[PDB]
Design an enzyme around this catalytic site. Structure first.
Site, PDB file in Angstrom:
ATOM      1  N   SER A   6       0.704  -6.350   0.953  1.00 31.27           N
ATOM      2  CA  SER A   6       0.247  -7.104   0.004  1.00 31.27           C
ATOM      3  C   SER A   6       1.148  -7.221  -1.146  1.00 31.27           C
ATOM      4  CB  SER A   6      -1.255  -7.094  -0.424  1.00 31.27           C
ATOM      5  OG  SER A   6      -1.404  -5.636  -1.255  1.00 31.27           O
ATOM      6  N   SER A  34       4.766  -4.702   2.104  1.00 25.58           N
ATOM      7  CA  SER A  34       4.725  -3.178   2.658  1.00 25.58           C
ATOM      8  C   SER A  34       5.062  -3.499   4.066  1.00 25.58           C
ATOM      9  CB  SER A  34       3.462  -2.440   2.317  1.00 25.58           C
ATOM     10  OG  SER A  34       3.386  -2.086   0.862  1.00 25.58           O
ATOM     11  N   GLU A  65      10.704  -0.202  -4.087  1.00 25.13           N
ATOM     12  CA  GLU A  65       9.370  -0.448  -4.687  1.00 25.13           C
ATOM     13  C   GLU A  65       9.289  -0.018  -6.074  1.00 25.13           C
ATOM     14  OE1 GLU A  65       7.368  -0.939  -0.911  1.00 25.13           O
ATOM     15  OE2 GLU A  65       7.039  -1.638  -2.869  1.00 25.13           O
ATOM     16  N   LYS A 117       7.979  -1.512   5.522  1.00 24.76           N
ATOM     17  CA  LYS A 117       7.987  -0.125   5.462  1.00 24.76           C
ATOM     18  C   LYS A 117       8.166   0.277   6.793  1.00 24.76           C
ATOM     19  CE  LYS A 117       5.364   0.863   1.151  1.00 24.76           C
ATOM     20  NZ  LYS A 117       4.308   0.468   0.685  1.00 24.76           N
ATOM     21  N   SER A 170       1.002   3.650   3.218  1.00 26.09           N
ATOM     22  CA  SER A 170       1.433   2.553   2.199  1.00 26.09           C
ATOM     23  C   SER A 170       2.066   3.165   1.026  1.00 26.09           C
ATOM     24  CB  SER A 170       0.776   1.338   2.091  1.00 26.09           C
ATOM     25  OG  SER A 170       1.346   0.069   2.240  1.00 26.09           O
TER      26      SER A 170
HETATM   27  O1  LIG Z   1       3.168  -2.357  -5.348  1.00 26.42           O
HETATM   28  C1  LIG Z   1       2.256  -3.536  -5.110  1.00 26.42           C
HETATM   29  N1  LIG Z   1       1.381  -3.324  -4.202  1.00 26.42           N
HETATM   30  C2  LIG Z   1       1.275  -2.286  -3.181  1.00 26.42           C
HETATM   31  C3  LIG Z   1       1.533  -1.159  -3.372  1.00 26.42           C
HETATM   32  C4  LIG Z   1       1.145  -0.226  -2.272  1.00 26.42           C
HETATM   33  C5  LIG Z   1       0.915  -0.643  -1.096  1.00 26.42           C
HETATM   34  C6  LIG Z   1       0.363  -1.976  -0.896  1.00 26.42           C
HETATM   35  C7  LIG Z   1      -0.151  -2.318   0.153  1.00 26.42           C
HETATM   36  N2  LIG Z   1      -0.087  -1.806   1.323  1.00 26.42           N
HETATM   37  N3  LIG Z   1      -0.862  -2.513   2.439  1.00 26.42           N
HETATM   38  N4  LIG Z   1      -1.484  -3.550   1.948  1.00 26.42           N
HETATM   39  N5  LIG Z   1      -1.067  -3.454   0.542  1.00 26.42           N
HETATM   40  C8  LIG Z   1       0.668  -2.814  -1.929  1.00 26.42           C
HETATM   41  C9  LIG Z   1       2.450  -4.524  -6.138  1.00 26.42           C
HETATM   42  C10 LIG Z   1       1.651  -5.638  -6.120  1.00 26.42           C
HETATM   43  C11 LIG Z   1       2.022  -6.688  -6.884  1.00 26.42           C
HETATM   44  C12 LIG Z   1       2.966  -6.698  -7.659  1.00 26.42           C
HETATM   45  C13 LIG Z   1       3.824  -5.685  -7.742  1.00 26.42           C
HETATM   46  C14 LIG Z   1       5.052  -5.722  -8.821  1.00 26.42           C
HETATM   47  N6  LIG Z   1       5.593  -4.329  -9.167  1.00 26.42           N
HETATM   48  C15 LIG Z   1       6.585  -4.425 -10.026  1.00 26.42           C
HETATM   49  C16 LIG Z   1       7.139  -5.769 -10.598  1.00 26.42           C
HETATM   50  C17 LIG Z   1       6.417  -6.804 -10.496  1.00 26.42           C
HETATM   51  N7  LIG Z   1       5.494  -6.879  -9.580  1.00 26.42           N
HETATM   52  C18 LIG Z   1       3.749  -4.395  -6.823  1.00 26.42           C
HETATM   53  O1  LIG Z   2      -0.825  -1.044  -6.006  1.00 25.23           O
HETATM   54  C1  LIG Z   2      -1.241  -2.069  -5.622  1.00 25.23           C
HETATM   55  N1  LIG Z   2      -1.852  -2.531  -4.720  1.00 25.23           N
HETATM   56  C2  LIG Z   2      -2.166  -1.702  -3.618  1.00 25.23           C
HETATM   57  C3  LIG Z   2      -1.599  -0.311  -3.682  1.00 25.23           C
HETATM   58  C4  LIG Z   2      -1.909   0.437  -2.681  1.00 25.23           C
HETATM   59  C5  LIG Z   2      -2.296   0.442  -1.681  1.00 25.23           C
HETATM   60  C6  LIG Z   2      -3.175  -1.164  -1.519  1.00 25.23           C
HETATM   61  C7  LIG Z   2      -3.895  -1.087  -0.273  1.00 25.23           C
HETATM   62  N2  LIG Z   2      -3.684  -0.416   0.907  1.00 25.23           N
HETATM   63  N3  LIG Z   2      -4.738  -0.729   1.968  1.00 25.23           N
HETATM   64  N4  LIG Z   2      -5.594  -1.914   1.204  1.00 25.23           N
HETATM   65  N5  LIG Z   2      -5.219  -1.910  -0.043  1.00 25.23           N
HETATM   66  C8  LIG Z   2      -2.697  -2.003  -2.340  1.00 25.23           C
HETATM   67  C9  LIG Z   2      -0.912  -3.156  -6.908  1.00 25.23           C
HETATM   68  C10 LIG Z   2      -1.800  -4.323  -7.109  1.00 25.23           C
HETATM   69  C11 LIG Z   2      -1.194  -5.196  -7.792  1.00 25.23           C
HETATM   70  C12 LIG Z   2      -0.463  -5.034  -8.787  1.00 25.23           C
HETATM   71  C13 LIG Z   2       0.151  -3.985  -8.792  1.00 25.23           C
HETATM   72  C14 LIG Z   2       1.322  -3.805  -9.801  1.00 25.23           C
HETATM   73  N6  LIG Z   2       2.275  -2.748  -9.953  1.00 25.23           N
HETATM   74  C15 LIG Z   2       3.259  -2.625 -10.868  1.00 25.23           C
HETATM   75  C16 LIG Z   2       3.380  -3.753 -11.613  1.00 25.23           C
HETATM   76  C17 LIG Z   2       2.940  -4.807 -11.310  1.00 25.23           C
HETATM   77  N7  LIG Z   2       1.830  -4.791 -10.442  1.00 25.23           N
HETATM   78  C18 LIG Z   2       0.135  -2.895  -7.734  1.00 25.23           C
END
Ligand SMILES: O=C(Nc1cccc(-c2nnn[nH]2)c1)c1cccc(-c2ncccn2)c1
Ligand SMILES: O=C(Nc1cccc(-c2nnn[nH]2)c1)c1cccc(-c2ncccn2)c1
Ligand SMILES: O=C(Nc1cccc(-c2nnn[nH]2)c1)c1cccc(-c2ncccn2)c1
Length: 260
Positions: free
Chosen positions: A209, A42, A138, A45, A102
């Site tokens: 992340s 992210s 995303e 972004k 995010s």
């Molecule tokens: O979308 C994933 N993580 C996520 C979503 C929104 C915000 C944040 C974030 N912002 N600041 N720190 N974290 C992280 C995510 C994570 C792991 C795997 C996947 C994933 N999505 C689709 C297919 C395969 N993997 C998405």
């Molecule tokens: O949504 C996931 N991570 C996430 C999302 C939104 C915010 C944050 C965050 N912001 N500030 N601190 N933490 C972290 C996430 C995590 C692992 C896996 C997935 C995932 N999504 C779709 C497919 C596969 N994995 C999403």
């Protein structure tokens, strides 16, 4: 010596750390793996929001343009966009949501406004960043597979482009100030770079992340009594299921701050 401390942190962490500092007091840099690629997650972004701000320079009303949010548009983390399903969000609202919360649906709308991931890359190239690449939307841009060049950049490149966007002239003055205001209003950053800085300092940042325990943060920092800094900390781990390690980014920031 800062490099040796960052190497020790990296070794104990089990993962791979990348750091780039630019100190605008003297334009000097500290780099650790500064030319290795890391998955942005992210932190990308910022580039998408900046690209829309650039477009708004020649369309003074663009940030007020409504964008439809349909149920099918929601992805996996949509804290703001879910409230607006079957309604609309302006490009300003989408930028603020993507940057400060995010929100992934918001990021997808910014990507779409630029014509897809490669429109964000094109904006990066237009401001002199030859390294950044956005290849996917995303949420799959966060897969963070080791060795995969998709959706990556280097710490050196990202620090330079964050400096140009927030402190330099990649954007018009009104847009630069808007970006800085958004970053300073981030809600997600207290455990990352900012946790390793003296509390008197002010900062804005964007976290990220993903899979492989990928844990990232990019910051613009205004120390007490010093010119601003730009700091990028990227971290990724060898197993897909690894837990996120915001503490490692804090530790890296503390080593950097202590080395000023
Ligand atoms: O979308 C994933 N993580 C996520 C979503 C929104 C915000 C944040 C974030 N912002 N600041 N720190 N974290 C992280 C995510 C994570 C792991 C795997 C996947 C994933 N999505 C689709 C297919 C395969 N993997 C998405
Ligand atoms: O949504 C996931 N991570 C996430 C999302 C939104 C915010 C944050 C965050 N912001 N500030 N601190 N933490 C972290 C996430 C995590 C692992 C896996 C997935 C995932 N999504 C779709 C497919 C596969 N994995 C999403
Ligand atoms: O041009 C569009 N997308 C795109 C994707 C990847 C790379 C690039 C590129 N490379 N170098 N310069 N640009 C451009 C695109 C795709 C769909 C819609 C639109 C669009 N643009 C303006 C108004 C309406 N639609 C543009």
């Amino acid at each position: 010596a800062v490099q040796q401390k960052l190497a020790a942190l990296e070794k104990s962490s089990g993962g791979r750390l990348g750091v780039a500092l630019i100190d605008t007091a003297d334009n000097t840099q500290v780099l650790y793996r500064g030319d290795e690629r890391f998955p942005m997650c992210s932190t990308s972004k910022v580039m998408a929001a900046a690209a829309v701000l650039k477009q708004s320079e020649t369309q003074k009303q663009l940030l007020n343009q409504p964008v439809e949010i349909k149920p099918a548009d929601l992805v996996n983390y949509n804290p703001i966009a879910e409230k607006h399903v079957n309604g609309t969000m302006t490009l300003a609202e989408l930028s603020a949501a993507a940057l400060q919360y995010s929100d992934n649906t918001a990021m997808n709308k910014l990507i779409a406004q630029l014509g897809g991931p490669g429109g964000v890359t094109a904006f990066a190239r237009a401001i002199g960043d030859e390294t950044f690449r956005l290849d996917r939307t995303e949420p799959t841009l966060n897969t963070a597979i080791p060795g995969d060049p998709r959706d990556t950049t280097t710490p050196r490149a990202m620090a330079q482009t964050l400096r140009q966007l927030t402190l330099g002239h990649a954007l018009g003055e009104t847009q630069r100030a808007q970006l800085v205001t958004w970053l300073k209003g981030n809600t997600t950053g207290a455990a990352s770079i900012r946790a390793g800085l003296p509390t008197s300092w002010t900062a804005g940042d964007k976290t990220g992340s993903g899979d492989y325990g990928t844990t990232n943060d990019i910051a613009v920092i205004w120390p007490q009594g010093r010119a601003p800094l730009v700091l990028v900390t990227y971290f990724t781990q060898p197993q897909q299921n690894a837990e996120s390690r915001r503490d490692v980014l804090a530790s890296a920031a503390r080593i950097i701050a202590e080395g000023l």
